[PDB]
Design an enzyme around this catalytic site. Structure first.
Site, PDB file in Angstrom:
ATOM      1  N   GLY A  49       8.807  -4.615   0.038  1.00 38.88           N
ATOM      2  CA  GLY A  49       9.295  -3.914   1.410  1.00 38.88           C
ATOM      3  C   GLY A  49       9.450  -2.478   1.405  1.00 38.88           C
ATOM      4  O   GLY A  49       9.597  -1.795   2.236  1.00 38.88           O
ATOM      5  N   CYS A  84       6.971  -0.406   0.619  1.00 39.51           N
ATOM      6  CA  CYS A  84       5.776   0.276   0.896  1.00 39.51           C
ATOM      7  C   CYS A  84       5.810   1.393   1.940  1.00 39.51           C
ATOM      8  O   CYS A  84       6.878   1.095   2.958  1.00 39.51           O
ATOM      9  CB  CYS A  84       4.689  -0.642   1.261  1.00 39.51           C
ATOM     10  N   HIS A 132      -2.695  -0.558   4.609  1.00 33.83           N
ATOM     11  CA  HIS A 132      -2.597  -2.370   4.481  1.00 33.83           C
ATOM     12  C   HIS A 132      -1.483  -2.718   5.541  1.00 33.83           C
ATOM     13  O   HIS A 132      -1.494  -4.070   5.239  1.00 33.83           O
ATOM     14  CB  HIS A 132      -2.519  -2.418   3.107  1.00 33.83           C
TER      15      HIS A 132
END
Ligand code: XEK
Lengths: 299, 295
Positions: A142, A144, A40
């Site tokens: 943040g 991820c 993503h």
């Protein structure tokens, strides 16, 4: 004593980079000449409900991915998608690459998490994969691309990459081949975790640890059958205990002399009575995030 | 969201760990520039005469699979300083600091020069730490990271009968009333770190655990009289001001939260948990809660 120790994070720190695509910045894992990160990272916020990643990726060019290790920029010379992970090929192998392998772990298994923001690690903690395939981590926006791992000898086994925070506040992610743990999808549509249960085999391993460190107050004279135990433990949202779980505990049973099905009887009684104000190994709750393998390593 | 006992990433310290061996004893040492730091009890009691007979080659210093030639020795309080032939190319920016009871730090537990686990600790009011150590751990070190600078604060020396641990700062001064001798030693009666419990209640609120909140407020004196009753540490005015940032980020004033705490001290929790714990957790500082729950 018994503390929840994480693994030394040094080998993983040397692999964390930040990956930027448009206005999106998250963390990637730089191993050899590949950077891995959640797919993503290529998404816009309008596409979030129903993203077509194949359609989005075919439109991207290498020079759209800004990868940055420390001060250095890395040039992306190729890219491909595997399940829910994006693989960015880079023009220089990471010299800090440790010996490593990718592994898919099972519920009940423990690992360390290196929480990162903008490619800089900020903390490490121990975690377990819940039976509902979520993890009760500590992740801010943040995070991820942060990864979970175990270290065995000098081999880093990467088992988790962080993708998202569910509505209930728990965390969902994939293995390093991009397949989710559990029934989740990297889409902003409604999805709910199965009811979370206690990891019975881990609780028992923790009681054996308590007995090894001297604490016997919870032991009783009774034994039980595997089916009597599971019938009681299900009523408390405990995971069924299998004969394999029984086999995994045999070493701790031998070490302490308490048969596995005796220890099960003590756990039955602890569920019935509560702690009655006491503590086991410094906890006033039944601890389910130490595996049988863990107990033996630090005991 | 989520809240965990979180240690600093230990990579900057892993690059400084080495094994030191004197005779039968092997324990871990801290290698910075051209000096290796370790507990002086590795020479084994009188240490002045005991170290004056040991020669440089009495100390085998293995940095992984390579050997360091000890070319000098020196003692500062309870810590041995072995001068080595070559500087550690992985030496971080660092300083030695001494921490206060109530303050937290990360610990890199080693076994035979091999770092094997990291965990977050608090210096207890009785100057001990509840750590997880097995044999070989001595000279395992505690630290904080701030920017890129490592602050070393702790070197482990001994286990205590209670299962708790005692050690020194990196200049060899003990934390607490302990000596590095085979004498029988007991930890003093411990107390709970009140400002940390409060910072932890603030972390629970930030994570949506709100049930323990109440309409009331209290006063430091009325509250402090109930702390002493429950073996809690005096809350001082500096503690309040320290909890200030969280007081705003949530709308709960510190003496409002103290009414919550007094009311949990008095009546416990009605079979309820706070951040997944059945006990009041006092090993997170106000700074720990901020660095983890906002940025
Ligand atoms: C652009 N961008 C995005 C992120 C980022 C994205 C996400 C994220 C990723 C995906 Cl695929 C989602 F479907 C998603 O909708 C969650 C949701 C909403 C409503 C109903 C159900 C569901 Cl499931 C969220 C995220 O959850 N987090 C996060 C936040 C807090 C803790 N952990 C993870 C962060 C980032 O870190 N950096 C960056 O530049």
């Amino acid at each position: 004593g018994f503390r929840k120790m994480a693994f030394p994070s040094g080998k993983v720190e040397g692999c964390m980079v930040q990956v930027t695509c448009g206005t999106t910045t998250l963390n990637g894992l730089w191993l050899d000449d590949v950077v891995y990160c959640p797919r993503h990272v290529i998404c816009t916020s309008e596409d979030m409900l129903n993203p077509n990643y194949e359609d989005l990726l075919i439109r991207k060019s290498n020079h759209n991915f800004l990868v940055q290790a420390g001060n250095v920029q890395l040039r992306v010379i190729g890219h491909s998608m595997q399940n829910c992970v994006l693989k960015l090929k880079v023009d220089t192998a990471n010299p800090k690459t440790p010996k490593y392998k990718f592994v898919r772990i099972q519920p009940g298994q423990t690992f360390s998490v290196l929480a990162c923001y903008n490619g800089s690690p900020s903390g490490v903690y121990q975690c377990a994969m819940r039976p509902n395939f979520t993890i009760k981590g500590s992740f801010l926006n943040g995070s991820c691309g942060s990864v979970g791992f175990n270290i065995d000898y000098d081999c880093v086994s990467f088992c988790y990459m962080h993708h998202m925070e569910l509505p209930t506040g728990v965390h969902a992610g994939t293995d390093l081949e991009g397949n989710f743990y559990g029934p989740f999808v990297d889409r902003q549509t409604a999805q709910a975790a199965g009811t979370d249960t206690t990891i019975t085999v881990n609780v028992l391993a923790w009681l054996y640890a308590a007995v090894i460190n001297g604490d016997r107050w919870f032991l009783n004279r009774f034994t039980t059958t595997l089916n009597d135990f599971n019938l009681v433990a299900m009523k408390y949202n405990y995971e069924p205990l299998t004969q394999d779980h029984v086999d995994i505990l045999g070493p701790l049973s031998a070490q302490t002399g308490i048969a596995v099905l005796d220890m099960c009887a003590s756990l039955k009684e602890l569920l019935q009575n509560g702690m009655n104000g006491r503590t086991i190994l410094g906890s006033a709750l039944l601890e389910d995030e130490f595996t049988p393998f863990d107990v033996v390593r630090q005991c």
